[PDB]
Every structure is written in structure tokens, then in C-alpha cells.
Amino acid sequence: WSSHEQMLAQPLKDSDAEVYDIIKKESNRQRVGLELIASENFASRAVLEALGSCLNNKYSLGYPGQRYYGGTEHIDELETLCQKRALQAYGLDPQCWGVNVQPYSGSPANFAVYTALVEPHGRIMGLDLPDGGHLTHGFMTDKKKISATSIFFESMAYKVNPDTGYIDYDRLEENARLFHPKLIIAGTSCYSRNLDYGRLRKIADENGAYLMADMAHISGLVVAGVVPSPFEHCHVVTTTTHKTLRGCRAGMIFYRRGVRSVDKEILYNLESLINSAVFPGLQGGPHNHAIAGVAVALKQAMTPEFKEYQRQVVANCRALSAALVELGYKIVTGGSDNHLILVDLRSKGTDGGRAEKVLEACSIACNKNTCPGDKSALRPSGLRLGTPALTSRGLLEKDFQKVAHFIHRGIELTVQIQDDTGPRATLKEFKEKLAGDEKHQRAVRALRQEVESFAALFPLPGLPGF
Amino acid sequence: WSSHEQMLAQPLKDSDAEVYDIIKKESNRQRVGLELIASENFASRAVLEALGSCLNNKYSLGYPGQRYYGGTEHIDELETLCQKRALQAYGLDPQCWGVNVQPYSGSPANFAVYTALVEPHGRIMGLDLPDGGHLTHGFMTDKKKISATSIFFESMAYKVNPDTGYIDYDRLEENARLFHPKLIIAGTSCYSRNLDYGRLRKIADENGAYLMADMAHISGLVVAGVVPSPFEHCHVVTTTTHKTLRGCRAGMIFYRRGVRSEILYNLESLINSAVFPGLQGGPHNHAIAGVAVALKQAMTPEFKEYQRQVVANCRALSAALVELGYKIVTGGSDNHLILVDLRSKGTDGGRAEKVLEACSIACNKNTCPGDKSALRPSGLRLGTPALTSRGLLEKDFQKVAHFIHRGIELTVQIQDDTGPRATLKEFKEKLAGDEKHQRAVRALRQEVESFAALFPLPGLPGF
Amino acid sequence: WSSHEQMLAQPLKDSDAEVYDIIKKESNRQRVGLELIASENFASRAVLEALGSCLNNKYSLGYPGQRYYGGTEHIDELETLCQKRALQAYGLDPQCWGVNVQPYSGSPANFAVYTALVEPHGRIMGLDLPDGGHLTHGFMTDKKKISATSIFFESMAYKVNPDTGYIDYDRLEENARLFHPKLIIAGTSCYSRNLDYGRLRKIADENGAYLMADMAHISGLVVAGVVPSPFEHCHVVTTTTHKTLRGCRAGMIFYRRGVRSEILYNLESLINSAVFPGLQGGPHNHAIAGVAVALKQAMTPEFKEYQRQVVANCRALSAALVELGYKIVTGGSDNHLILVDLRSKGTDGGRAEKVLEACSIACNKNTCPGDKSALRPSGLRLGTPALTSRGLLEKDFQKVAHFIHRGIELTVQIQDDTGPRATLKEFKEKLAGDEKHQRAVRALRQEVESFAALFPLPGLPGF
Amino acid sequence: WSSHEQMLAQPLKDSDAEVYDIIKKESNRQRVGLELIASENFASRAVLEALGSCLNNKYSLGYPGQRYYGGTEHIDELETLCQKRALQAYGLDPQCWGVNVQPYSGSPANFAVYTALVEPHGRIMGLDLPDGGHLTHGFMTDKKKISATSIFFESMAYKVNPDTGYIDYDRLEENARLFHPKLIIAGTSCYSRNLDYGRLRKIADENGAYLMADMAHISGLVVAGVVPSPFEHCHVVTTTTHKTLRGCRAGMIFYRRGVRSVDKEILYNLESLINSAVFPGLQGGPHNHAIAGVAVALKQAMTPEFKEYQRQVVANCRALSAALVELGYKIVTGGSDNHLILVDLRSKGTDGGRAEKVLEACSIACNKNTCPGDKSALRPSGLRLGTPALTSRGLLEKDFQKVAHFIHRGIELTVQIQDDTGPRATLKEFKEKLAGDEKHQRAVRALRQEVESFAALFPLPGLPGF
Numbered sequence A, D: 001w002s003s004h005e006q007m008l009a010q011p012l013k014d015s016d017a018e019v020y021d022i023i024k025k026e027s028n029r030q031r032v033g034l035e036l037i038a039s040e041n042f043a044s045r046a047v048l049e050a051l052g053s054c055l056n057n058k059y060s061l062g063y064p065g066q067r068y069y070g071g072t073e074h075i076d077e078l079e080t081l082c083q084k085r086a087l088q089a090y091g092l093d094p095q096c097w098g099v100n101v102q103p104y105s106g107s108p109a110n111f112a113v114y115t116a117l118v119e120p121h122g123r124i125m126g127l128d129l130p131d132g133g134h135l136t137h138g139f140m141t142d143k144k145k146i147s148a149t150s151i152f153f154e155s156m157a158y159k160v161n162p163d164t165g166y167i168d169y170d171r172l173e174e175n176a177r178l179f180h181p182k183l184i185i186a187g188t189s190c191y192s193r194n195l196d197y198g199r200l201r202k203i204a205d206e207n208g209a210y211l212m213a214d215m216a217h218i219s220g221l222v223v224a225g226v227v228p229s230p231f232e233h234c235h236v237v238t239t240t241t242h243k244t245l246r247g248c249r250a251g252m253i254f255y256r257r258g259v260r261s262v263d264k265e266i267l268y269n270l271e272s273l274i275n276s277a278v279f280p281g282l283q284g285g286p287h288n289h290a291i292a293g294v295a296v297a298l299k300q301a302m303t304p305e306f307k308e309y310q311r312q313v314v315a316n317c318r319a320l321s322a323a324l325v326e327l328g329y330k331i332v333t334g335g336s337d338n339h340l341i342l343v344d345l346r347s348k349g350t351d352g353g354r355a356e357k358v359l360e361a362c363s364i365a366c367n368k369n370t371c372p373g374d375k376s377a378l379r380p381s382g383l384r385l386g387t388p389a390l391t392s393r394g395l396l397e398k399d400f401q402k403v404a405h406f407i408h409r410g411i412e413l414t415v416q417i418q419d420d421t422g423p424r425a426t427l428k429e430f431k432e433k434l435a436g437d438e439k440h441q442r443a444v445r446a447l448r449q450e451v452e453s454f455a456a457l458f459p460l461p462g463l464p465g466f
Numbered sequence B, C: 001w002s003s004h005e006q007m008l009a010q011p012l013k014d015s016d017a018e019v020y021d022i023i024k025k026e027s028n029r030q031r032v033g034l035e036l037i038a039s040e041n042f043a044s045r046a047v048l049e050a051l052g053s054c055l056n057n058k059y060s061l062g063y064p065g066q067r068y069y070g071g072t073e074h075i076d077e078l079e080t081l082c083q084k085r086a087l088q089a090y091g092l093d094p095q096c097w098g099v100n101v102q103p104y105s106g107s108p109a110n111f112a113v114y115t116a117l118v119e120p121h122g123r124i125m126g127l128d129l130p131d132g133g134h135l136t137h138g139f140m141t142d143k144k145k146i147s148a149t150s151i152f153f154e155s156m157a158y159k160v161n162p163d164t165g166y167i168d169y170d171r172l173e174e175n176a177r178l179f180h181p182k183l184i185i186a187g188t189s190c191y192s193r194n195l196d197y198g199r200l201r202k203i204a205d206e207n208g209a210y211l212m213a214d215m216a217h218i219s220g221l222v223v224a225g226v227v228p229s230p231f232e233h234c235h236v237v238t239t240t241t242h243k244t245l246r247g248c249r250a251g252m253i254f255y256r257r258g259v260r261s262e263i264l265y266n267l268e269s270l271i272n273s274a275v276f277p278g279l280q281g282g283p284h285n286h287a288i289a290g291v292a293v294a295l296k297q298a299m300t301p302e303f304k305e306y307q308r309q310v311v312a313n314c315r316a317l318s319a320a321l322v323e324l325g326y327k328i329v330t331g332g333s334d335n336h337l338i339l340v341d342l343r344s345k346g347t348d349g350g351r352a353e354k355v356l357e358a359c360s361i362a363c364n365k366n367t368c369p370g371d372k373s374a375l376r377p378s379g380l381r382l383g384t385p386a387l388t389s390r391g392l393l394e395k396d397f398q399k400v401a402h403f404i405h406r407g408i409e410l411t412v413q414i415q416d417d418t419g420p421r422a423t424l425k426e427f428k429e430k431l432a433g434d435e436k437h438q439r440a441v442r443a444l445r446q447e448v449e450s451f452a453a454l455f456p457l458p459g460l461p462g463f
């Protein structure tokens, strides 16, 4: 009862060792492995220091202008600061753009926008999942609506041409006239090319819809001016703050302000609709410590060191892609414009499903993804590979070429295990063959060793080995 | 680069001073003031240490055994550990109960349950807001649906009797037959009594509905066995992990497993599917680690102690206010908070929260069951969790009752100088623009901050 | 062809004898029996002559002045005439009221209004079915939405006090604040009293809702000025044109025009758009001609007379039944029908409607406000419109009360031979399978058919 | 008060002269004019005699098997008879097909099926209106949902190829995979070719949807075996009973019964869903007199005189179309397979909007309709023309050739008035020029005279000049 006070002060290491132990083992796993997953990255030490601040303790509903309670002098300073830096980082004029920084994550942010501009059962159009789209853009089958976007709104996808790997803007322009979308989403999870915001904008205006850009995967590249900005043509732009922006987990909603169109002119009503949808609509108290982390990350994103980091990110992808082409791999759309590439593993007689398990055992992380062609979702042909994470650890073009060879070694290994499993074998069985087979298990042990040795040569951002 | 390598290592203090400065000023404000807001509390140092871990970097879509990406050996250990401790802390048999720990916060958790059990336009019944209910339980007017619960589902509220301050279970039982709810919510934001879970459960079963308990405000009291557990009669129980449980911000959804009547429970898969891939993306692992750490602390006897203290202080605080002539809604309290009806002093919570705020005493206005206007709320909601974490005891809270009283007297004064009838904007003008008054505040604040500084402020050493 | 030319000219009798035979047998059944069903009536010969006109052949999408096809000079004359007579018959100023006469029937009319003023998932409040409400006002259970009104909109019922038999306006006023209806329906299928339109209107305005009156059952009484007009307080009034108005089957939607409060009424265009192109296609012109003919007859003093007679007979019928020991719900009636609570005789309307049916006395079962079961309805609904059109007067209805009584006694008997507890299928078996009984029926039927034949049967000369 | 009885017996002529007068003037208008509107026809005398029967007086809720009230011995005989004749007329085995005959009209029938199989906000796919579709198949714009089908369900249209005039089945097969319809509608209001039920059925089964056929416009041709039956591939078939079937106004819903598919087999659940949706779902008491009329019409539809009438209907269309082609007119899809044709008036420098008004003044009835091309809905290019009505009056191939010339005279006249109105003139003004111009008004008066003389040579089915 008297030790209760020594409880709220006791460091984590002493307080709870079981959790401490896990954090350590995870920190170590992150260190000796190769992170090639397009969505992961390492947050800076400063950003992580903000998350554990006393900002966790302040409960504040509403926005800076109008809060439900008092005692928000500093929380207002903070939210305001965060909003200013966000507009600044993307070079936006606060008279033409606004920003909400309360979303808890990427998904929540998207959902808030649909709830504000679309309304229940409203129509939304997004990139089909197998063609590189995201769940929050809509996902359903003929018998069931899986994603929330599909459960509460009426969604229909547009696809990419399976022969070019690019988005079929023509067919989208046609279907939009039949579907009458209230909002069209321009954003992807596994697409290596730049989106034609200008064309998508012409299509949106043609049907009187809104053009929303979910730039979660390229927000970092956009700030460094390495890829066209979606802010030139969209009405709204949402984004996670982790991934390429390299902050903590949180989301943001950017929206236009001022005169929309003329004749005599009509105004943008986005701001109030969106603010109302986030709160009191969908959320409660904002996670202030997360806003502080986002703020810290936006300041770092405007440094020239970051702009450099990003040019490096893109350059490594080119090198990685070139090295894999030379090794005989087929890259969707032939190449990339950003930080990732979708490797069509059919050109090697295997599929991404079995390939991600073998590479994983070898401490090389990445994930399977269907290629535009793919006649089956149960046997995805590709592997999605990104460079943001490894580039933060300092890898350069020559380093990524070595990575290309490790990945290749892995694909060769997975192919060996596939011929050993059979023709109509199941992924369930493949995974068993991969664990209970000394012959294959030996190869893995070997490759993993070379991968972990190489990985250890580079630093691991964050707090002191924690 | 050579500098980019260290930019990611530069401590916050050096890296970004503008934000660092803010965190310091806020930490200080938290120290010299009296936190009487029922929903706030101070998270322990250990919990905060987990939030800033390298767990922020791991992206893990899915659940343990149902992961999308590889390399989740430890994230699985962590999520699993967190789920085990959650069931343990509330004394639940994993054969009869399950738990999802991915919700980002309280609201998200509630919304996921509605999405899983109710479905679009389904009917939901919750406690009316002015009667102490929460937004996520439904909130609409005759011309507009404000809360998401009201926008995507069909909600209708049940009220409390304005003469007793208690929930009118009889009228609810009657309306439920006409409304046909698919889910009834049992949870409150400003109600000082225990909920009759057993009666609410009989009503739910009568209409074939589900009984969901949103125990966000009393999850801490429940773990310490200080107030009846909603786990005895509900099908689902959601909860924030901050507030009385004293963790970081996150939410949890508890759901029954096993036989319902032979018919079985289908909650688990519906709820898991609704959280992800339904509503959320990658889970905030660092928050799950914080929740895990908080659940272990919640099972210590020191916590059990902390909680009995929380309830005790409320009783003392309420008794001291009654003696000072204040009227407590429903006469008293069973938990950690009380709704003080300020009509008994000729003022309203609207003006009173601004004056107490100026004096570094934090709390908020709330309408009393009677109240014929939402623009002039009669009460003040006061909670003890936060100050109790700083070590205040019964005698300390009696001194607090006097500070609050001083405040009410002061708010009344600015009100007597304004005249029986005057807008709120006038009242504030007279408070900030008067020698004798802004002077009164300055004085009271000084006594409040001196008293406050005598107690510790939990958290990381010092920002 | 030479025969195809005449196939289209061959009279029904020669053309299709099988159908002709059926029409004859039905016309005869209608003659020798006693029609006591509150919703049935006999349409005049003139009205029936219009239905078979060459108006069936004209396809006219749209409205007068808003037609889609050409060649509508006369269809416009007709629709316009019909609209003028409708407003006239109810004494409405075309500057304050409008009317749509395209609905195919009562139900379609109601549905069009909901679709125009309420919108998908909008809230509607109507009289509960077991308390004398109609399906189109909403009908659902805890597990399923039966009526279309319940499937496409969110409906909740209000009830009558089971101790007075009257609508509980107080409880409705209370629930309306919690439910927030967008439209409240004031109309009944089995309620013998006048509705308090003024009170319902105050409640509608309190929640910003619309007050719709479905006067299908009393449209005839309203035209004759025999019962208060719902046109004094409602925004919209829908109605079937058969039943008490005595026309052919069709519906009408009356809606306010002008200033609502300066805010104006937007009903007209919403309602017109909802009927077409919204819900319907080409209007049934021959039915509109029949309605027109019926509205002219409704304004004659002979009709005004017919109606006072209708109400008078009900009073006599109810008084004679009270004297025979029967209990009338809410003690009596204000209109054309009465709900007889058969519990006062130890039987239920379920068994009683089958026995009276066998005796050529038609009517139907209906639950009484009390009734703890929908599978064993306590009452019998009885109306006088139909028999009054055949010329029955007060003295005649007293004889009818005796036939009905004889019937109740008989149904009770088969019930005493079955034992205090026995399923319904048993009861019917004993009725049709017993010498003394099937014999009783045969006897009573004979007296009923003899009495019935003494009166004329309106309609075309003789089929 | 005593005359009240003489009121319910007084004939219409004496009772209400104002309405009687209207019926007469209308009967006469019908006689001296040429009915070329594809949806109109003349009901036989027998059918009209049933409508005014004492069947109007019987109120009966429910279906033959289970009614809410008693005294339905004959109403059951009648409904049952009507159901038997309906299945018979279309050659359906009552073990494989069922029928509901309570719908009040075509629209109500369609709506009942959507409500039973689709459910609120369910997805439906129908032929686009400007491409010859019907309102009840769905009709909306980017800013508003007009038709009830669009207000209560989520509809999206499929189009016809504007270069061939035919339905683009390929594009529909593609969009159906993205839209996931729960029901696909196969039926048209202005399409002159036969629908590929077999292909549409393959597409329905591909998405697990239902194939509904709205054969309102060709129900008569189907009974005479003059055009392929939709009953071979559809799950449900709805239909009005007027139009080509030549009965009174009412609707019917035909639905499959028995085993749907195998594996072990699953059954059809259409019957109960559809019956429940009609009542107590959407309707109240059925219009018995209308069911009697439908019954009488179905018996006439099975006579060889009818089968002959129908072959005649189709033959006249061919002749009419051939005569118009020879006069230089362009028929959409080159010709017709059924009873109607869409004449593209662009080939003459005018539009259907102005043409329908001039022909109307000349007592030649028909209506405008957009052609697949048409870049504007406010200036429809075509005229829809049908032969059912005139064929019932006895016109034959040679008669229709004379009709083609009257129509031509009309088009020539409308073109004269168009050059006289101007370039950017409005249809509002065109109509004024047409009424306040003796020059043009003289032409009309003349043509009308020749049209009415020709029309009077033929009989007008129905009751004795009433």
C-alpha cells in the first residue's frame, strides 16, 4: 500500500521484466535482419522520446479553437504547432489548405473523410486490391462486404491494365459515368508508378465527385519533392505519418479551403465537415503524445538531410530493381518511380506465397502480393519489396546489389523446396516440408547466417538498443 | 549521410527544442494544479517506457496465428501475453471469455462491436447523454445525427428518473419492446451509482438483444473488486485502458466464448473481423505493450489498495461538500465520481468550471437529470482517481472541498456583480476585468498551487 | 383475320364461360349473405361502368401539363376533373390543398408519401397493429421486418391504453422525444373512436415531424361531415377510394399547399415525383374515371344521408349487442365499426369468425387491446357500411345482432363439446363433423340467407 | 334519401354525364387516329366486361392457400384458374415454375421482386435508360436518385454499343465482376432485337446473382412463339398484362421452383420470398376484377387467332421498317426482331423531340427516344414506333406502307417548321411556331384529314363505341 508510490516510478526493467525481455528480443530481431517490407521504417529517437511524454496524461476533447474542458494552453500550442509544420512541410498556403492531425492512424483518417463527404451508402471508387489498392479504399466479394468502407458505403473498384501494369484511366472514366461516384480515391499500397492526379481530377469533376488522395506510401517522397505532389489536383489528401514519413503511428487529413468554383462562386465546405466527422463523430480524446511525435517528425522531414535520405531511397530502389532484372527477374510495369517494386515471381517458376516464407526463415522480410495478371488470389505471383527501412540504416546502391543476391539465393532455395513438395501440393504442406526437412533447413541456416552478418554491419535507429 | 545517421539519434531536447519546451511547461502545469476531472489519471513510468520502445517499428497486420506478414515471433509473444493478463486481471476463464486488444482507443472499440453485432442501421439503445451517457452510445437531435453511432446505426436513448437520479429500468423495459434493440449498452460517463447488469440482462434477453457493457470509467474499480463486475451478466464488455485502469490510451473488447443456450456464441470471429480487416490497419504494438504492463500493475495488491483509496476519497469529498451545503445527484456515490448540482448555490456548472480553472482546479460542467437547458448545465462532475494517484487521502480531499467551495463562492460573486441575468460572455469579462476579482483568483490559485506541490507527480523522472 | 376481328368483340359470356360462371356464383354469394366486414362495400353501377371503358387503352405517363406522350387532351380533362371533385368533396381550397389521384390503391399511396417525405431509413411512428393499426403504418417483430414500411424505413409503434381502449397520447408524446420521428401516422383499421388530430399535430410540430392521416376507413364519413375532418390539422391525408367512400379500388394523396410558417410547403413536388417516375408507371385511367364518378356521388345529399344511416346502424347494432351481454371495446363507437370483446362470452374471435362464416355471416377476428396472445384474438370487428348500402335500418340491424348472437352461442357449443382446452383445428373438426352441429349451422345459415335476400344488391343489373 | 337506392343503380350516362362525355370523346379520338405507340394496345370486349364485375366488391387478403378472411370459395377458384392459365400459356411445368398474379401493374411487380431477392441497398444491374432501358430497372444521375429502384437499392446500368445498336455483353461481363450485382435485369422498353438470355445467364451465375427478365414489351410475342422465350434461362420473369399480351392493366411474377443447383443439391427459395414481398409486404387487397380480366386475356392468348395476330404484328413491323428504309430513314441496329423500331431521325436533319409534336397534331401518335449515339438527352434523335395497336385494328403489310408515307409526310412537315424557327431555337418556341402559324397549321389540318380518313376504315376493338 505504501509501495504503490514506488510502483508508479519503478523503471520498466525492474517493474515488468517479462515485457522488457520481449522488447529486447524484438529490438535484436530488428537488428540482425533485412527489412524489405515497403510499409515499415525506423522512427528517430526524438520522435520516440515524445511518445512517452507526460502528454499522455492530458485529456482534451475538441480542437484548439473550441475545447470541451479547460487547461489546454500547451496542448493548443502543440496541436497548433503540429498543424503549422504539416502545411509548411508540404508547402501549402494556410489560406488554401487546412489540416486535421487527430486521426489515430491511416485507416481512421480515411474513414473520417468518407463519413464527412460521402455519407452512408454513398458511392466511392478506389483501386482494386489485387491491382495494388488498399482495404480502406473498399474491399468486397460477391457474397460479403469485408472492409468497413464497403460495409458502410457503396464501393466499386477500378483496375490496372494487366498488360502494362498501369492504371486503366480510360475504363475508369467510362465506368464513373455509369456508377456516379461521390468520391474517387487516388492512392495505392503496391503500385510502383506515379498517379495521374490531373487526369483523375478531370474525371472527378466530370461526375461532380471529390478527388481524395491517400498518399500514405509516398508522403515522405512528396515532402522531399522526389515524386509529383498530389496537392496540385486533389481536394483532400490523407496520410499515415509512419511509413516513408518516418514518424510514429498517426494520421492526417489535408483539405482545401476557400473558393471551390465560379460561374458567382461557391465555397469549400470541407473543413467543418471533416473536423466534425473526426470529433465528435468518430473519435474521442486525441492522443496528444502521438501528435507531439508527428510534430517532431515533420520538423525532421523538412531538413535537407531528409531530402537527401529520400533521394537515396529512390536511388536504392532503382539499383535493387536493376540488379534483379539482371538476375533474370521480371518487375511489374518494367520498373519503378518510387520506393517499391512488385517482382513477378512467375518468371522463375514459383509464387510469392512460398517465397515469403523461405525469405522470412532467412531473416529477409517482405510480403507476397498478386500481380495484375494472376488468375488466383490463393497463389499470388509477386513479392513486394521496398527500400525505406534499409536506407534509414544507411544501405547504398552497392549494398542493395548484395541484397538482390541474398533475395535471389532465397528464391533459388524456395524453388528447390517446391520441386521437392510436388505438383498439386498445398502451402500448408510446403510450410511443413520447410520445417521438418534437414536438407532444406540446412540451406536456410546457412543463408540466414550470411544475411544476419551483413545486417549487423549497419546501425539500428531508435533508443539505446531498446 | 554522416549527419542523417545521427539526426535519428539526436535526443529530443537537442533535436526539437520547441516541442521539448511545450512538454516541460505542460508537465509543470500538471504538477501545480488539482486534477479533479473524472476521466484523467497519471500513467506509471514503466508504462510510458514501453510506449517509446522499438515496438513502434513493427508492422503486424492480423492476429497471433492469423498474421499477414512474417517476422512476428515476438509481437505474437507480446499480443498473447497481453491477452492472457487481460483475462487474468478480471478473473475470466479463457474457455468462457476472449479478448481483442487491438482497438486504438475507447471509441474505436465501441464502434467495432456495433459493426460486428449490430450491422448498418441496426438498433442500439444507450443512456441519454444529458443523463450521464457517452457519445459513442448514440447522440442525435431531431434535425441531425452527430455521433457516428447515430449516423451509421439507429439509436434511441433511455433516461434516468429526474427525481431519484437513478436509471429508470422500468421505462426502458417498456420502450425496448416497442423499439426492438439489437444491442443495449450499459455504461456511463457521469453516473455515480452501480448499474443493474442483471436487470439489464433480463431486458436484453427479453428482446433477443445483446447486452454490452462499456466499463471505461470503472475498469480500475472492477479489477480491484471494489464495485460489481459487469462480466457476470454481459455478452460483451469494452473498455479504455487509461482512466481508472491507469494505463496508456487504448481499448479492449471482451467477449463471451462457449455455449449461449445447443446454440453457441459467434462473437469472437465477428468482433475480430470487425476490428481488422474491417475498421483498423496495423495495430499500435507499443500501446499494447503499455497496456500489458498496466494490466500486470493492476493485479498487484498495491493497486487493489489504490482503488479502495480512490472510492474512500470520493466518499470523503462528497461528505465534505454535503456539509458545506452542496447537493449531490442521487444523494451520493458508489464509485470514483460525483455530480454536484450547483443549483443549490444559485449558479451553474458553466460559469463554475471557468472560475475553478483559473484557480488551477480542473473539472468540467455536466447537466443534471433535471436541467431544462443544455446551454446552462447545473452540475460539476468531480472525480478522485488522478489526485489519489498523487497520494491524497481523506483529510486532503476535505481541504480540496474547501478550495472548490472558495471557487464556487467566487464564481457566484462575479455573478452578483453581473446581475441575476447576464450572458456567459459577460460573466467571463467581469472575472478577468475587475480588480477585486482577478485578484481573488490570483489569491486562490496561489493557495491551490502551494497545496498541490506538496504531492508527487507520477511519470518519467523529469522532462 | 376474320375471326380474330370478332374474338375481340365476343361478349364475356360466350368468350370465356369458366370465368363468367365464377362471377355469377360470386355475385350470388354476395347476395344471400350478410356482409359485416368493416372494409367492404358495394360500388354503384355507374362507377363499374367507367372501369370497363376504353380508358383502359390510353397510356399516359406523367401528369396534366407534365405528360410524356401526346394525345392526352381527354385524359387531362379527366384527371383534372377528378382532382377538382376530390378537393370539392372534402371542402378544400385549391390554394391551400392539392391532390394526387394516381395511386393504384391504399397501400401504394401510403408508401409514396413515406418515400417522398421520409426517405430511406427515416423514422415513422404509427398505431401498433394489435391496437388497431394498419400494416402500411409499420409492422415488425424482434427478429424480422414484415411490412414494406418496416423494411425500407425505421418504424416504431405507439399503443392504446388497454384499460380505456383509447390511444395513449401522453406516452406517445414522451416516446416521440426519444425516437425523433420524421413522420407520425394518424389512421386506424380497427379503432371505433375519433382521433385527436389537434393533439397529434402538437406532438408532430414538437419534434418537427409531419402529421399524416390515413383516413381510409372513414373517408366516406368525413365527406358527409359525420366525423371530424383530419384536414384541419394534418399536412397530408391519404385514402383508399373504396371502403366507406364506396368507389372502385384506388388511392389518393392530399397535401397542403402554401405557407407553412416565410417558409413554404414543398409537399406537392416531392409527392408527385415519388408517385411517378418514382414508384409507378402508367396510371390506371379507368380507375380514375371510376373515382371521379364516385366523388360526384359522394357529394349528393343522398350520400350524406347514407352516411348518417351508416353511423346510426352501428349505434343500434352495438346497443343490441350490449343488451345481449356483449362487451364493446372502449364502450362504444363514434364511427362505422365496433370491436366486440368475445372474452365476455368465453370464446375468441378466432373460432367465432369460422362459425359465423359457415352461417353466411361475414366478419373477421381482431385482437383486443388487452390480449396476451396474437394466436387467440379475443375480438370480432364488425362494420355497417356494406349492409347499409343494401338498405338495412336500425330495426334490421337488431335482427342481425340476434343472428350474430346465435352464431356465438353455436361456436361456444362446439367449444363445450371440445373441452375448455383444445386446439383450433380440433374445434373446426367438431363443427364440420357432428350431426347436431353441422345441423345447427345449416339451420342458421338458412335463416340468414332468407333475411339477406329481402334486400337489393347494388351493382350492374345482373351478371 | 329514398333516391339513394336509385343512385346505386342509375346508369353512368344518366348518373354522371360529365365523365360519360369524356369517355365518348376519348373513344372517338382513339378511333380516328393512328396509334403507333409501342406500349399501347386495345383490350378485347370480354376482358373489359370482367373488370366491371361484382368482383370489385370482394376484399380478400392473402393467397388461395391461406387467406386472412373467409368467404373466398370463388375468389380462390378465380385466382387459381388465373395462375393455371398463366403457366399454360407460356408452356411451363408447375413443378418447375410458379406464378404470382396479384401485382397491380408492371412497376409494382418489378419492385416486389427486388424487395424479395435483393433487399435494401442490394445491387441491381439493368439496361441504361437512354440505351432503351426502363425506369424500374434503375434510373439516377450524379446528384439524385430518381426511380424507386435507385432510391431503395444500389443500381448501375450496362449499355449498348453505340456503333452496332446492340447490347455490349462483353463490357457487362467485365463490370459485373467489379460491381457484384445481386440481380441482373434483362428487359427493355426500346430495343428492337432479341436478348441473349443464355449469355446473360452465364454472367449471372458467374457472380452468383439472379437473372430476372422483364418481358413486359414482348410477353405477347413470347406466347405465340414468335421470339425466343426468356423462360429457358431466367430465374424470374415479370410482366405487365397489357401491351402486347393485350389484357387489362396488371402484372405477374413468374419464378422457378425445385432444385436450383447441385454439388448435395440446394433448392429455390423464390416462391415464398416473392409471395411474402407482394403481400403482406408491399400490397393490400388484390384487385380481383383485374385478375379476372387477366385470366380472360390469357385464355385468348392461347388461341390460334392470337398466334396469328402476333405473326402479323411482327410482319407489319418488318414492312413498316422496310418502307421507311426505302424512304431514306435509318433504323437503329438496321432493323427489328420484334414489334418495334427506333428510327434515327438525324438522317433527315431533325430530332424526335420536334417530330413527335407534329405527328401528334396530325393524329399520328408515337414518342421520342434517344438513340445510342445521342450526346444530349434534351434533343433525342429518334422516334420509337410499334405495331401491336394498329395490327389489332386489322392493318396488314400494305396498310403499314401507307402509314410509312403519312409518317414521312409528317417528318417533312416538322423539318419545314424547324428551318422556319431557326438555329439555336428552343422546343418551347418550336411548339409556339407550330400553333400560331397559319402557314404550318394549314399543312397539319390537311395531313390530319388524310390520316383520320384512313384510320376510320378500320374497326376499334372494345365495348359498343364506348
Ligand SMILES: *Cc1c(COP(=O)(O)O)cnc(C)c1O
Binding pocket: A039, A105, A106, A107, A108, A134, A136, A187, A188, A189, A214, A215, A216, A217, A240, A249, A250, B280, B281, B282
Ligand atoms: C498502410 C496504409 C494504410 C493504413 O494505415 P494504418 O496506419 O495502418 O492504420 C492506409 N492507406 C494506405 C495507402 C497505406 O499504405
Ligand SMILES: *Cc1c(COP(=O)(O)O)cnc(C)c1O
Binding pocket: A283, A284, A285, B039, B105, B106, B107, B108, B134, B136, B187, B188, B189, B214, B215, B216, B217, B240, B249, B250
Ligand atoms: C471516456 C470514455 C470513452 C472514450 O475513450 P476514448 O479513449 O477517448 O476514445 C468511451 N466510453 C466511455 C463509457 C467513457 O467514459
Ligand SMILES: *Cc1c(COP(=O)(O)O)cnc(C)c1O
Binding pocket: C039, C105, C106, C107, C108, C134, C136, C187, C188, C189, C214, C215, C216, C217, C240, C249, C250, D283, D284, D285
Ligand atoms: C384497408 C386499409 C388500407 C389498404 O388498402 P388497399 O386498397 O387494400 O391497398 C390502407 N390503410 C388503412 C388505414 C386501411 O383501413
Ligand SMILES: *Cc1c(COP(=O)(O)O)cnc(C)c1O
Binding pocket: C280, C281, C282, D039, D105, D106, D107, D108, D134, D136, D187, D188, D189, D214, D215, D216, D217, D240, D249, D250
Ligand atoms: C411499360 C413497362 C413497365 C411499366 O408498367 P406499368 O404497368 O405501366 O406500371 C415495366 N417494364 C417494362 C419493360 C415496360 O415496357
